[PDB]
Paper text:
To understand why OsGA3ox1 produced higher levels of GA7 compared to OsGA3ox2, we performed X-ray crystallography analyses of these enzymes. As a result, we succeeded in obtaining the structure of the OsGA3ox2 complex with (co-) substrates; GA9 and 2-oxoglutarate (2OG) at 1.9 Å resolution. Fe (II) was eliminated for crystallization to prevent the enzyme reaction, as previously described. The carboxyl group of GA9 established interaction with S230, G231, F233, T234, and R337 directly or indirectly through water, and its γ-lactone ring established interaction with the main chain of I119. These amino acids are conserved between OsGA3ox1 and OsGA3ox2, but not between OsGA2oxs, OsGA20oxs, or even AtGA3oxs, with the exception that I119 is replaced with Y in OsGA3ox1. Moreover, upon comparing the structure of OsGA3ox2 with that of OsGA2ox3, we found that the GAs were inverted in the substrate-binding pocket. Conversely, the residues H227, D229, and H285 of OsGA3ox2 established interaction with Fe (II); Y212, S297, and R295 established interaction with 2OG. These amino acids are highly conserved in almost all 2ODDs, except F235 in OsGA3ox1, which is a conserved Y residue in other 2ODDs. Taken together, these results indicate that the substitution of a highly conserved Y with F in OsGA3ox1 contributes to the hyperproductivity of GA7. Whereas the main product of OsGA3ox2 was GA4 (OsGA3ox2), we found a remarkable peak of GA7 as well as GA4 when we analyzed OsGA3ox1 (OsGA3ox1).
Numbering used by the authors: 12 to 354
Write the structure that this text describes.
Amino acid sequence: CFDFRAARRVPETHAWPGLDDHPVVDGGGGGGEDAVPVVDVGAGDAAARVARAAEQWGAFLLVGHGVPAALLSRVEERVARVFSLPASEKMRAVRGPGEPCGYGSPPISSFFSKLMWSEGYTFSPSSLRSELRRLWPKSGDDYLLFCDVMEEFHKEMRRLADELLRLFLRALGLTGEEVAGVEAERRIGERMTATVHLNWYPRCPEPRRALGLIAHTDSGFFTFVLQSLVPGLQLFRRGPDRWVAVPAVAGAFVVNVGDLFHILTNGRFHSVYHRAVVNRDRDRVSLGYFLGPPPDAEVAPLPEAVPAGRSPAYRAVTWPEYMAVRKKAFATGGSALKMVSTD
Ligand SMILES: C=C1C[C@]23C[C@H]1CC[C@H]2[C@@]12CCC[C@@](C)(C(=O)O1)[C@H]2[C@@H]3C(=O)O
Ligand SMILES: O=C(O)CCC(=O)C(=O)O
Protein backbone atom coordinates (compact mmCIF):
# COMPACT_ATOMS: atom_id res chain seq x y z
CA CYS A 1 0.00 0.00 0.00
CA PHE A 2 1.21 3.57 0.78
CA ASP A 3 5.01 3.71 0.42
CA PHE A 4 6.35 5.38 3.57
CA ARG A 5 9.90 4.98 2.28
CA ALA A 6 9.28 7.03 -0.90
CA ALA A 7 7.05 9.81 0.47
CA ARG A 8 8.77 13.21 0.39
CA ARG A 9 5.87 14.66 2.29
CA VAL A 10 2.98 13.60 4.50
CA PRO A 11 -0.25 13.59 2.41
CA GLU A 12 -3.50 14.83 3.90
CA THR A 13 -4.75 11.24 4.48
CA HIS A 14 -1.90 10.90 6.98
CA ALA A 15 -1.99 14.35 8.49
CA TRP A 16 -3.31 14.84 12.01
CA PRO A 17 -4.52 18.27 13.22
CA GLY A 18 -4.20 17.90 16.94
CA LEU A 19 -0.64 16.80 17.39
CA ASP A 20 0.85 19.70 19.28
CA ASP A 21 -2.19 20.59 21.35
CA HIS A 22 -0.18 19.68 24.46
CA PRO A 23 3.44 20.37 25.28
CA VAL A 24 6.07 17.59 25.34
CA VAL A 25 8.49 17.54 28.27
CA ASP A 26 11.65 15.51 28.82
CA GLY A 27 11.23 12.28 30.74
CA GLY A 28 14.92 11.42 31.17
CA GLY A 29 16.49 11.19 34.60
CA GLY A 30 16.98 14.92 34.89
CA GLY A 31 13.31 15.57 34.09
CA GLY A 32 12.28 16.27 37.66
CA GLU A 33 8.60 15.70 38.50
CA ASP A 34 8.43 14.17 35.00
CA ALA A 35 11.42 11.83 34.95
CA VAL A 36 9.92 8.45 34.06
CA PRO A 37 10.28 6.16 37.12
CA VAL A 38 12.74 3.31 36.85
CA VAL A 39 12.17 -0.02 38.60
CA ASP A 40 14.98 -2.58 39.10
CA VAL A 41 13.09 -5.80 39.38
CA GLY A 42 15.68 -7.60 41.47
CA ALA A 43 16.02 -4.75 44.05
CA GLY A 44 14.57 -5.36 47.49
CA ASP A 45 12.39 -2.28 47.27
CA ALA A 46 10.92 -3.17 43.83
CA ALA A 47 7.34 -3.58 45.19
CA ALA A 48 7.38 -0.06 46.69
CA ARG A 49 8.73 1.52 43.50
CA VAL A 50 6.15 -0.38 41.46
CA ALA A 51 3.43 0.93 43.79
CA ARG A 52 4.42 4.57 43.36
CA ALA A 53 4.89 4.28 39.59
CA ALA A 54 1.64 2.36 39.01
CA GLU A 55 -0.31 4.86 41.14
CA GLN A 56 1.24 8.10 39.88
CA TRP A 57 2.17 7.28 36.24
CA GLY A 58 0.67 3.90 35.19
CA ALA A 59 4.08 3.13 33.66
CA PHE A 60 7.77 2.77 34.47
CA LEU A 61 11.06 1.71 32.87
CA LEU A 62 12.01 -1.81 33.95
CA VAL A 63 15.65 -2.83 34.39
CA GLY A 64 17.43 -5.74 36.02
CA HIS A 65 14.97 -8.18 34.45
CA GLY A 66 17.49 -10.84 33.47
CA VAL A 67 16.40 -11.18 29.80
CA PRO A 68 19.72 -11.58 27.97
CA ALA A 69 20.81 -8.51 25.99
CA ALA A 70 21.98 -10.70 23.11
CA LEU A 71 18.44 -12.11 22.85
CA LEU A 72 16.89 -8.65 22.86
CA SER A 73 19.10 -7.60 19.99
CA ARG A 74 18.15 -10.70 17.95
CA VAL A 75 14.48 -9.92 18.62
CA GLU A 76 14.89 -6.38 17.32
CA GLU A 77 16.71 -7.65 14.19
CA ARG A 78 14.00 -10.22 13.41
CA VAL A 79 11.32 -7.61 13.88
CA ALA A 80 13.10 -5.25 11.48
CA ARG A 81 13.43 -8.18 9.08
CA VAL A 82 9.66 -8.72 8.93
CA PHE A 83 9.07 -5.14 7.91
CA SER A 84 11.86 -5.08 5.29
CA LEU A 85 10.04 -7.79 3.36
CA PRO A 86 8.43 -6.69 0.09
CA ALA A 87 4.86 -5.43 0.25
CA SER A 88 3.73 -8.39 -1.84
CA GLU A 89 4.93 -10.88 0.78
CA LYS A 90 3.58 -8.96 3.74
CA MET A 91 0.12 -8.84 2.23
CA ARG A 92 0.15 -12.59 2.07
CA ALA A 93 -0.15 -12.49 5.85
CA VAL A 94 -2.67 -9.65 6.00
CA ARG A 95 -4.87 -9.48 9.04
CA GLY A 96 -8.33 -9.29 7.42
CA PRO A 97 -11.28 -7.29 8.80
CA GLY A 98 -12.05 -8.56 12.31
CA GLU A 99 -9.24 -11.16 12.37
CA PRO A 100 -7.00 -11.13 15.48
CA CYS A 101 -3.61 -11.84 13.85
CA GLY A 102 -1.44 -10.95 10.89
CA TYR A 103 0.09 -8.05 9.05
CA GLY A 104 -1.69 -4.73 9.29
CA SER A 105 -2.45 -1.68 11.40
CA PRO A 106 -3.76 -2.58 14.85
CA PRO A 107 -7.54 -2.54 15.47
CA ILE A 108 -7.60 1.03 16.89
CA SER A 109 -6.87 2.28 13.34
CA SER A 110 -10.33 1.50 12.04
CA PHE A 111 -11.95 4.01 14.43
CA PHE A 112 -10.03 7.03 13.11
CA SER A 113 -10.36 8.79 9.78
CA LYS A 114 -6.67 9.81 9.40
CA LEU A 115 -4.00 7.11 8.92
CA MET A 116 -0.99 6.30 11.15
CA TRP A 117 2.61 6.52 9.93
CA SER A 118 3.54 2.90 10.77
CA GLU A 119 3.10 -0.79 9.94
CA GLY A 120 2.18 -3.57 12.32
CA TYR A 121 1.98 -7.32 12.80
CA THR A 122 0.09 -9.17 15.59
CA PHE A 123 0.66 -12.78 16.59
CA SER A 124 0.04 -15.00 19.54
CA PRO A 125 3.17 -16.67 20.94
CA SER A 126 1.11 -19.81 21.65
CA SER A 127 0.53 -20.29 17.88
CA LEU A 128 3.59 -18.48 16.53
CA ARG A 129 4.84 -21.31 14.36
CA SER A 130 1.55 -21.74 12.60
CA GLU A 131 0.69 -18.02 12.25
CA LEU A 132 4.08 -17.06 10.79
CA ARG A 133 3.68 -19.66 8.05
CA ARG A 134 1.16 -17.20 6.56
CA LEU A 135 4.10 -14.83 6.03
CA TRP A 136 6.54 -17.61 5.00
CA PRO A 137 4.39 -20.37 3.43
CA LYS A 138 7.45 -22.39 2.41
CA SER A 139 9.21 -21.97 5.71
CA GLY A 140 12.92 -21.40 5.18
CA ASP A 141 15.69 -19.53 7.00
CA ASP A 142 14.05 -16.28 7.92
CA TYR A 143 10.98 -18.19 9.15
CA LEU A 144 12.92 -20.67 11.24
CA LEU A 145 15.18 -18.02 12.76
CA PHE A 146 12.22 -15.77 13.50
CA CYS A 147 10.37 -18.59 15.29
CA ASP A 148 13.45 -19.62 17.23
CA VAL A 149 14.15 -16.07 18.52
CA MET A 150 10.44 -15.40 19.29
CA GLU A 151 10.00 -18.71 21.11
CA GLU A 152 12.93 -18.07 23.39
CA PHE A 153 11.79 -14.49 23.94
CA HIS A 154 8.27 -15.68 24.88
CA LYS A 155 9.71 -18.18 27.41
CA GLU A 156 11.75 -15.38 29.10
CA MET A 157 8.93 -12.81 29.00
CA ARG A 158 6.26 -15.13 30.32
CA ARG A 159 8.46 -15.72 33.37
CA LEU A 160 9.15 -11.98 33.75
CA ALA A 161 5.41 -11.34 33.44
CA ASP A 162 4.75 -13.76 36.34
CA GLU A 163 7.42 -11.98 38.42
CA LEU A 164 5.94 -8.56 37.66
CA LEU A 165 2.42 -9.69 38.48
CA ARG A 166 3.60 -10.73 41.96
CA LEU A 167 5.22 -7.33 42.39
CA PHE A 168 2.04 -5.53 41.29
CA LEU A 169 0.04 -7.47 43.84
CA ARG A 170 2.56 -6.77 46.59
CA ALA A 171 2.42 -3.15 45.55
CA LEU A 172 -1.22 -3.13 46.68
CA GLY A 173 0.28 -3.53 50.18
CA LEU A 174 -0.11 -7.27 50.55
CA THR A 175 2.57 -9.46 52.06
CA GLY A 176 4.17 -12.23 50.02
CA GLU A 177 2.06 -14.67 51.99
CA GLU A 178 -1.19 -12.80 51.17
CA VAL A 179 -0.23 -12.56 47.49
CA ALA A 180 0.22 -16.39 47.49
CA GLY A 181 -3.29 -16.60 48.83
CA VAL A 182 -4.66 -14.42 46.04
CA GLU A 183 -2.80 -16.38 43.41
CA ALA A 184 -3.98 -19.70 44.89
CA GLU A 185 -7.60 -18.54 44.83
CA ARG A 186 -7.77 -16.69 41.48
CA ARG A 187 -4.88 -18.18 39.48
CA ILE A 188 -4.37 -14.85 37.75
CA GLY A 189 -0.78 -15.35 36.92
CA GLU A 190 -1.16 -19.01 36.02
CA ARG A 191 -3.89 -18.19 33.52
CA MET A 192 -2.88 -14.96 31.86
CA THR A 193 -2.32 -14.95 28.12
CA ALA A 194 0.31 -13.15 26.08
CA THR A 195 -0.22 -11.45 22.66
CA VAL A 196 2.47 -9.72 20.61
CA HIS A 197 2.12 -6.63 18.43
CA LEU A 198 5.09 -5.50 16.32
CA ASN A 199 5.31 -1.85 15.17
CA TRP A 200 7.57 -0.37 12.48
CA TYR A 201 7.79 3.47 12.47
CA PRO A 202 9.54 4.61 9.30
CA ARG A 203 11.37 7.96 9.08
CA CYS A 204 8.92 10.76 8.31
CA PRO A 205 9.63 13.92 6.39
CA GLU A 206 7.01 16.04 8.23
CA PRO A 207 6.82 14.83 11.81
CA ARG A 208 4.57 17.68 12.86
CA ARG A 209 1.87 16.23 10.60
CA ALA A 210 2.15 12.49 10.99
CA LEU A 211 1.41 10.26 13.98
CA GLY A 212 3.07 6.89 14.60
CA LEU A 213 0.50 5.37 16.92
CA ILE A 214 -2.78 6.92 17.98
CA ALA A 215 -2.98 7.90 21.68
CA HIS A 216 -4.65 5.16 23.72
CA THR A 217 -4.63 3.10 26.87
CA ASP A 218 -3.91 -0.68 26.53
CA SER A 219 -7.07 -2.65 27.41
CA GLY A 220 -5.50 -5.52 29.30
CA PHE A 221 -3.60 -6.02 32.57
CA PHE A 222 -0.14 -4.73 31.61
CA THR A 223 2.27 -4.61 28.69
CA PHE A 224 6.03 -4.76 28.19
CA VAL A 225 7.36 -2.54 25.41
CA LEU A 226 10.69 -3.33 23.78
CA GLN A 227 11.93 -0.58 21.47
CA SER A 228 14.91 0.30 19.25
CA LEU A 229 17.11 3.01 20.74
CA VAL A 230 15.24 5.81 18.94
CA PRO A 231 12.75 7.83 21.02
CA GLY A 232 9.07 8.09 20.17
CA LEU A 233 6.97 6.69 23.02
CA GLN A 234 5.18 9.42 24.97
CA LEU A 235 3.08 9.08 28.14
CA PHE A 236 0.23 11.53 28.91
CA ARG A 237 0.07 13.22 32.31
CA ARG A 238 -2.50 15.65 33.68
CA GLY A 239 -2.29 18.83 35.81
CA PRO A 240 -1.37 20.26 33.50
CA ASP A 241 -2.05 18.14 30.38
CA ARG A 242 1.24 17.17 28.75
CA TRP A 243 3.20 14.42 26.95
CA VAL A 244 6.29 12.97 28.64
CA ALA A 245 8.95 11.79 26.21
CA VAL A 246 10.16 8.37 27.39
CA PRO A 247 13.94 8.03 26.95
CA ALA A 248 15.38 5.20 24.86
CA VAL A 249 17.47 3.25 27.42
CA ALA A 250 19.63 0.27 26.49
CA GLY A 251 18.31 -2.94 28.16
CA ALA A 252 15.12 -1.38 29.63
CA PHE A 253 11.54 -2.39 28.83
CA VAL A 254 8.78 0.12 29.43
CA VAL A 255 5.84 -1.39 31.42
CA ASN A 256 2.38 0.18 30.74
CA VAL A 257 -0.52 -0.57 33.04
CA GLY A 258 -3.77 -1.25 31.21
CA ASP A 259 -7.55 -0.83 31.74
CA LEU A 260 -8.32 -4.26 33.15
CA PHE A 261 -5.64 -3.73 35.86
CA HIS A 262 -7.27 -0.39 36.70
CA ILE A 263 -10.45 -2.44 37.22
CA LEU A 264 -8.68 -5.17 39.13
CA THR A 265 -7.21 -2.60 41.56
CA ASN A 266 -10.45 -0.64 42.11
CA GLY A 267 -8.89 2.32 40.31
CA ARG A 268 -5.70 2.33 42.37
CA PHE A 269 -3.28 1.74 39.49
CA HIS A 270 -3.50 4.22 36.62
CA SER A 271 -4.09 2.96 33.06
CA VAL A 272 -1.62 5.11 31.12
CA TYR A 273 -2.59 6.97 28.02
CA HIS A 274 0.24 6.90 25.53
CA ARG A 275 1.12 7.53 21.89
CA ALA A 276 4.08 7.09 19.57
CA VAL A 277 5.45 9.97 17.48
CA VAL A 278 7.46 9.65 14.31
CA ASN A 279 10.77 11.19 13.57
CA ARG A 280 12.57 12.68 10.72
CA ASP A 281 15.89 10.83 10.84
CA ARG A 282 15.51 7.25 11.94
CA ASP A 283 13.22 4.26 11.47
CA ARG A 284 12.45 2.38 14.62
CA VAL A 285 10.76 -0.83 15.61
CA SER A 286 8.95 -1.71 18.81
CA LEU A 287 7.26 -4.86 20.15
CA GLY A 288 4.48 -4.84 22.75
CA TYR A 289 4.02 -8.03 24.78
CA PHE A 290 0.49 -7.71 26.15
CA LEU A 291 -0.70 -9.65 29.22
CA GLY A 292 -4.36 -10.14 30.08
CA PRO A 293 -6.83 -12.77 31.37
CA PRO A 294 -8.10 -15.76 29.34
CA PRO A 295 -11.35 -14.99 27.43
CA ASP A 296 -13.62 -16.72 29.94
CA ALA A 297 -12.36 -15.11 33.14
CA GLU A 298 -14.35 -12.24 34.74
CA VAL A 299 -12.27 -9.33 35.89
CA ALA A 300 -13.60 -7.27 38.80
CA PRO A 301 -12.01 -5.35 41.62
CA LEU A 302 -10.02 -7.66 43.89
CA PRO A 303 -11.46 -7.75 47.44
CA GLU A 304 -7.94 -7.16 48.67
CA ALA A 305 -7.86 -3.91 46.66
CA VAL A 306 -11.23 -2.60 47.81
CA PRO A 307 -10.77 -0.68 51.12
CA ALA A 308 -12.87 -2.12 53.97
CA GLY A 309 -16.44 -0.91 54.06
CA ARG A 310 -16.24 0.42 50.43
CA SER A 311 -18.06 -0.77 47.35
CA PRO A 312 -16.37 -2.02 44.16
CA ALA A 313 -15.80 0.84 41.75
CA TYR A 314 -16.24 -1.26 38.61
CA ARG A 315 -18.59 -3.99 37.33
CA ALA A 316 -17.23 -7.44 36.39
CA VAL A 317 -16.31 -7.82 32.73
CA THR A 318 -14.63 -10.46 30.61
CA TRP A 319 -11.92 -9.26 28.15
CA PRO A 320 -14.14 -9.93 25.12
CA GLU A 321 -16.97 -8.03 26.81
CA TYR A 322 -14.64 -5.20 27.62
CA MET A 323 -13.34 -5.03 24.01
CA ALA A 324 -16.94 -4.39 22.94
CA VAL A 325 -17.10 -1.55 25.46
CA ARG A 326 -13.85 -0.14 24.05
CA LYS A 327 -15.21 -0.25 20.50
CA LYS A 328 -18.28 1.65 21.64
CA ALA A 329 -16.09 4.15 23.48
CA PHE A 330 -13.94 4.82 20.38
CA ALA A 331 -17.00 5.52 18.22
CA THR A 332 -18.83 7.67 20.72
CA GLY A 333 -15.94 9.66 22.19
CA GLY A 334 -16.50 8.14 25.63
CA SER A 335 -14.18 6.37 28.10
CA ALA A 336 -14.49 2.55 28.38
CA LEU A 337 -13.42 2.66 32.05
CA LYS A 338 -16.16 5.16 32.90
CA MET A 339 -18.64 3.01 31.00
CA VAL A 340 -18.01 -0.02 33.23
CA SER A 341 -17.63 1.99 36.43
CA THR A 342 -20.20 1.83 39.19
CA ASP A 343 -20.83 5.63 39.06
C1 LIG B 1 -3.98 -8.25 22.77
C2 LIG B 1 -4.26 -7.14 22.12
C3 LIG B 1 -4.06 -5.78 22.69
C4 LIG B 1 -4.41 -4.87 21.56
C5 LIG B 1 -5.52 -5.67 20.91
C6 LIG B 1 -4.87 -7.05 20.79
C7 LIG B 1 -3.73 -7.03 19.82
C8 LIG B 1 -3.05 -5.70 19.52
C9 LIG B 1 -3.15 -4.77 20.69
C10 LIG B 1 -3.10 -3.32 20.30
C11 LIG B 1 -1.72 -2.82 19.99
C12 LIG B 1 -1.69 -1.35 19.61
C13 LIG B 1 -2.79 -0.50 20.20
C14 LIG B 1 -3.98 -1.23 20.76
C15 LIG B 1 -4.96 -0.36 21.51
C16 LIG B 1 -4.52 -1.71 19.49
O1 LIG B 1 -5.18 -1.12 18.77
O2 LIG B 1 -4.01 -2.99 19.27
C17 LIG B 1 -3.62 -2.54 21.47
C18 LIG B 1 -4.78 -3.43 21.91
C19 LIG B 1 -5.30 -3.29 23.31
O3 LIG B 1 -4.58 -2.93 24.20
O4 LIG B 1 -6.45 -3.59 23.51
O1 LIG C 1 5.70 1.81 20.01
C1 LIG C 1 5.58 2.12 21.21
O2 LIG C 1 6.51 2.49 21.99
C2 LIG C 1 4.19 2.03 21.77
C3 LIG C 1 3.89 0.54 21.83
C4 LIG C 1 2.41 0.55 22.05
O3 LIG C 1 1.88 1.52 22.61
C5 LIG C 1 1.62 -0.54 21.49
O4 LIG C 1 2.13 -1.22 20.54
O5 LIG C 1 0.47 -0.65 21.96
